[PDB]
């Protein structure tokens, strides 16, 4: 008017086809939006802070710490960013019996990032007047010959006698020491005499934090791996500066090696069959590693490191732009 | 939408306006074209970036979280652990989904408002030197060349400068 010049106010459209939901309206095509939800992983188990996990593989935590002969690959392991059991982690206690407070031991290990293994009661040195062979046993075989745990030492009679031992270790490692022993409960024994030379025997283990006596329960028990005897496994965490004392007249499966523990946050035990690879991640799940800065993920509730928050959602898209109306 | 502009009295968007979320189209003797409004786009980008950053800040990363084991005589505590893990997951899934829905509503309305307020700000500059011809457009009652168009876009339109020529045209009809 007169010449018809015009100005119009309007808003952007584009060819975006992403949609967001609102409360009033589902599937609204917007011009710009962001996805808040990570749903991708690389299908591998990776290092954190340059440290590889510990892959126990065919072994479980019990076979690892006790030193099952099938776990010899683990002997040199001293530090890890997390611990991995697989769906085939079955080599644990090769000589049958209960691992006492095992779920607690697993909870403790979950905050251990490394250790220093050492020979707590060196074999054939700390035991001048007891036998140190046989067992050994076929239940725990290696290369088709009876063998034993690499960390425990099965003590036996020195020909018909067995004097009340008293072996004591003082913790001068400057940290907690995890000490494992066993107590053997032979069947109709007989065997009791044949191994320990004394029939009314006992084991006693003492420190400030822990004190317990064990009487052998000699009895008829089903065969497990050709063995009708059973063996109970025990652990304790010896405090820095404190003293642990073993006393017995038989049936002691004694500590040979023990572990000096380094605590660390951010570590843990996971079950995964994914393969380990030389990759690095800040976030690890049992399905695989996440490389993401998104605030949520739907991959797995189990996480090592620093991860997005697990939610059940399959979609979380947040609008940034406006309703997209490229054509009328 | 709540403010009546987007998919409202301004029926559709413009794929031809590339530089921003809101802006202008003009036609005069020199030609036609689009131009984003920078100030309104900037303020919207400030709010939306802040909104997204606030969502991120409230939702903390999760650090190491692993399972626990229980023996065959610890079913009560095993189930309690389960109830805790499931319940917190229910609550965080609910919170995340709902915050997204609620904020998406508010985001589309904010854009709608912004368009409305830009329309009204231009209308209020032009007064009766232009007529409203629907769909977010104004027809000037005077010749408006590119310098004049730019004065509208930058908020310094000179009503008195064009008032007489406008009035003569407006009073002809």
């Amino acid at each position: 008017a007169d010449p018809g010049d015009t100005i119009c106010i309007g808003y952007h459209a584009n060819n975006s086809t992403d949609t967001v939901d609102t409360v009033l309206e589902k599937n609204v095509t917007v011009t710009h939006s962001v996805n808040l939800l990570e749903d991708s992983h690389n299908g591998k188990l990776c290092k954190l802070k340059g440290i590889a996990p510990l892959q126990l593989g065919k072994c479980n935590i019990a076979g690892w710490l006790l030193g099952n002969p099938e776990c010899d690959l683990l002997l040199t392991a001293s530090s890890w960013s997390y611990i991995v059991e697989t769906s085939n982690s079955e080599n644990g206690t090769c000589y049958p019996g209960d691992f006492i407070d095992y779920e607690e031991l697993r909870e403790q290990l979950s905050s251990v990032s490394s250790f220093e293994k050492f020979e707590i009661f060196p074999k054939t040195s700390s035991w001048p007047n007891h036998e140190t062979t046989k067992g050994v046993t076929a239940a725990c075989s290696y290369a088709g010959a009876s063998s034993f745990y690499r960390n425990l030492l099965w003590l036996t009679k020195k020909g018909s006698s067995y004097p009340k031992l008293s072996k004591s270790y003082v913790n001068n490692k400057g940290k907690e020491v995890l000490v494992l022993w066993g107590v053997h409960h032979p069947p109709t024994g007989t065997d009791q005499q044949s191994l320990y030379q004394n029939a009314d025997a006992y084991v006693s283990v003492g420190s400030s934090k822990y004190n317990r006596r064990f009487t052998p329960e000699i009895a008829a028990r089903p065969k497990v791996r050709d063995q009708a005897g059973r063996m109970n496994y025990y652990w304790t965490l010896l405090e820095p500066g404190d003293t642990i004392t073993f006393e017995a007249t038989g049936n002691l499966i004694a500590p040979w090696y023990a572990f000096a523990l380094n605590r660390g946050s951010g570590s843990g035990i996971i079950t995964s069959d994914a393969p380990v690879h030389d990759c690095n991640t800040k976030c690890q799940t049992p399905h695989g590693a996440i490389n993401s800065s998104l605030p949520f993920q739907n991959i797995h509730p189990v996480t090592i490191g620093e991860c997005p928050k697990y939610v059940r959602s399959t979609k979380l898209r947040m609008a940034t732009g406006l309703r997209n109306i490229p054509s009328i | 939408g709540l403010f009546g502009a987007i998919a409202g009295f301004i029926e559709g968007g413009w794929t031809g306006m590339i530089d921003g979320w809101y802006g202008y189209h003009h036609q005069n003797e020199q030609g036609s074209g689009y131009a984003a409004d920078q100030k309104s786009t900037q303020n919207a980008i400030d709010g939306i970036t802040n909104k997204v950053n606030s969502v991120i800040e409230k939702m903390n990363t999760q650090f190491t979280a692993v399972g626990k084991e229980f023996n065959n005589l610890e079913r009560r505590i095993e189930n309690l652990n389960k109830k805790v893990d499931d319940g917190f997951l229910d609550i965080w899934t609910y919170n995340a989904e709902l915050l997204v829905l609620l904020e998406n509503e508010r985001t589309l309305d904010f854009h709608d408002s912004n368009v409305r307020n830009l329309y009204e700000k231009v209308k209020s500059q032009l007064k009766n030197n232009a007529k409203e011809i629907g769909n977010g457009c104004f027809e000037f009652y005077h010749k408006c060349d590119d310098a004049c168009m730019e004065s509208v876009r930058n908020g310094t339109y000179d009503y008195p400068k064009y008032s007489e020529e406008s009035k003569l045209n407006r009073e002809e009809i």
């Epitope: 710009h32 | 590339i18 900037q42 980008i45 400030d46 950053n53």
Partner: antibody, heavy 121, light 109 residues
Framework: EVQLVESGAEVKKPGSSVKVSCKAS????????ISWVRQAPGQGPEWMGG????????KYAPKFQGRVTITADDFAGTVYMELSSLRSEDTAMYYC??????????????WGKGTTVTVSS | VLTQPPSVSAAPGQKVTISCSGS????????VSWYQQLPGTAPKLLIY???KRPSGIPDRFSGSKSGTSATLGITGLQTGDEANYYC????????????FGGGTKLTVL
């Protein structure tokens, strides 16, 4: 104020590519654009290109168009510059720098400290 | 490109001006910014929008723009002002891009 931290020094062969990163503090989403500017010794700076927030639009200098790609990971608060088909005259200090608003322009108010790229056979 | 003198000098307290000459596609219809650069550091913004000062920059520095040319003025000259100075603007022409001047080295005697 914002701090802009760039990735470490790079040494590359002619014909290869280099990718440099710039992480902006705060955020992580940004209401302002960020450009890459380089400076060969002892020459003036040359604007390579920049990227607009939300829109993701890029603009490149004619001298680099066709072989520079600028990208953003907004949840990481990071922008990247990839320069391909490297030549020995791509030997320079590479700076990120932010603009005052969402649009790329001549005014860049905060700069990274720069990272060196050396291209040699 | 924009044309600057390669090198300007003065004495403490004295005043020097660095000029920036372009064309109608660049300085002619766009805002001019100025950058200072010391050895081993990133360009630092001194003036934007032809003559505005960011905070941190003192009224000793100022800038001007006239037609196709821009000017940086430095009064009260100091030792620490010894540096390279670059002008910058938007060139709408070939394809749009930010162009910088070739640089002026200020030496303080």
């Amino acid at each position: 104020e914002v701090q802009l931290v760039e990735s470490g020094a790079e040494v590359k062969k002619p014909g290869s590519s280099v990718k440099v990163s710039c992480k902006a503090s705060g955020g992580p989403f940004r209401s302002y654009a960020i450009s890459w500017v380089r400076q060969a010794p002892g020459q003036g700076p040359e604007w390579m290109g920049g990227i607009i927030p939300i829109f993701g639009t890029t603009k490149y200098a004619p001298k680099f168009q066709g072989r520079v790609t600028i990208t953003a990971d907004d949840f990481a608060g990071t922008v990247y510059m990839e320069l391909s088909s490297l030549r020995s005259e791509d030997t320079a200090m590479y700076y990120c720098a932010k603009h005052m608003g969402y649009q790329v322009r001549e005014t860049m108010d905060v700069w990274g400290k720069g990272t060196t790229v050396t291209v040699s056979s | 490109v924009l044309t600057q003198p390669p090198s300007v000098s003065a004495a403490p307290g004295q005043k020097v001006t660095i000029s920036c000459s372009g064309s109608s596609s660049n300085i002619g219809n766009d805002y001019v910014s100025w950058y200072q650069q010391l050895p081993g550091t990133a360009p630092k913004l001194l003036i934007y929008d032809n003559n505005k000062r960011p905070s941190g920059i003192p009224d000793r520095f100022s800038g001007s723009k006239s037609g196709t040319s821009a000017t940086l003025g430095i009064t009260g000259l100091q030792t620490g002002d010894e540096a390279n100075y670059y002008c910058a603007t938007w060139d709408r022409r070939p394809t749009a891009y930010v162009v910088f001047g070739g640089g002026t080295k200020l030496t303080v005697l």
